[PDB]
C-alpha cells in the first residue's frame, strides 16, 4: 500500500526528469509542500502550485538546464523502515556541499546549510544531488 508518500514524491520527480516531463502532479500534503518549497528555494525545480479544494494536487514544474536535467539524483534517506535522525555535528553534506540535503528540524523543513547555520539538527529526509 502507500506507506511512504515522500519517497513517492521523489520517485515522481526522478521519473519525470528521466522522461523529459514538463511537470509533475501528485496528491499534496503539508510535508510535500514544505519539501517542494525547499526545492524551489534551492533551485532544483522551477515552480510548484497546489490546487484543488477537497483533494489537493501538488504540481511541480521541473527544470532542465541544457538538454540534461537539473535534479541529478534525488534519494530518500529517512525511510519508514529505518528513520535517520542526525545531530548538528553529524549533519551531512552531499556532493561535498554541491547538493543539499533536506532535513526536517524543529524550526521547520530546512536544508543542511540552513540548519547547520541555525545550530540545530534533525531528521534527514532526502539527498538532492
Amino acid at each position: 500500500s502507500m506507506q511512504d508518500p515522500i519517497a513517492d514524491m521523489l520517485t515522481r520527480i526522478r521519473n519525470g526528469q528521466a522522461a523529459n516531463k514538463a511537470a509533475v502532479t501528485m496528491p499534496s500534503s503539508k510535508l510535500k509542500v514544505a519539501i517542494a518549497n525547499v526545492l524551489k528555494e534551492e533551485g532544483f525545480i522551477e515552480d510548484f502550485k497546489v490546487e484543488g479544494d477537497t483533494k489537493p494536487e501538488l504540481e511541480l514544474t521541473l527544470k532542465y538546464f541544457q538538454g540534461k536535467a537539473v535534479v541529478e539524483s534525488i534519494q530518500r534517506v529517512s525511510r519508514p523502515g529505518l528513520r535517520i535522525y542526525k545531530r548538528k555535528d553529524e549533519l551531512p553534506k552531499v556532493m561535498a556541499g554541491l547538493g543539499i540535503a533536506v532535513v526536517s528540524t524543529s524550526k521547520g523543513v530546512m536544508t543542511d546549510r540552513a540548519a547547520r547555520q541555525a545550530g540545530l539538527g534533525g531528521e534527514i529526509i532526502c539527498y538532492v544531488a
Binding site: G81, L82, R83, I84
Partner: protein, 80 residues
C-alpha cells in the same frame, strides 16, 4: 521531583502486588532501527486497586520481597 515510570499491568493475581510491563523504545546499536523493548517489574501496591490491563505510574523504593523494589503512585487509564 521523583523519577517514575509508566507501564501497563501484565498480570494481577497476587496478594497485594502486581506486575507491570514497561515499554522502552531503543535504537539498535548496529542497525539503527528504533525497536520496542519491554521490562517486566514486580510492583507493590497496598490494597491492590489496579486490575489487569491498566496503565500505572511506578517509583522505586526499598526491597519489599524478592525482586519487588517498585511501588505505584498513580493508577491511570483503567479502561476495559
Amino acid at each position: 521531583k521523583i523519577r517514575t515510570l509508566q507501564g501497563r499491568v501484565v498480570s494481577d493475581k497476587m496478594e497485594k502486588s502486581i506486575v507491570v510491563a514497561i515499554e522502552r523504545f531503543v535504537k539498535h546499536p548496529i542497525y539503527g532501527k528504533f525497536i520496542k523493548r519491554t521490562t517486566k517489574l514486580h510492583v507493590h501496591d497496598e490494597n491492590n486497586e489496579c486490575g489487569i490491563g491498566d496503565v500505572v505510574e511506578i517509583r522505586e523504593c526499598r526491597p519489599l520481597s524478592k525482586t519487588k523494589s517498585w511501588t505505584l503512585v498513580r493508577v491511570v487509564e483503567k479502561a476495559v
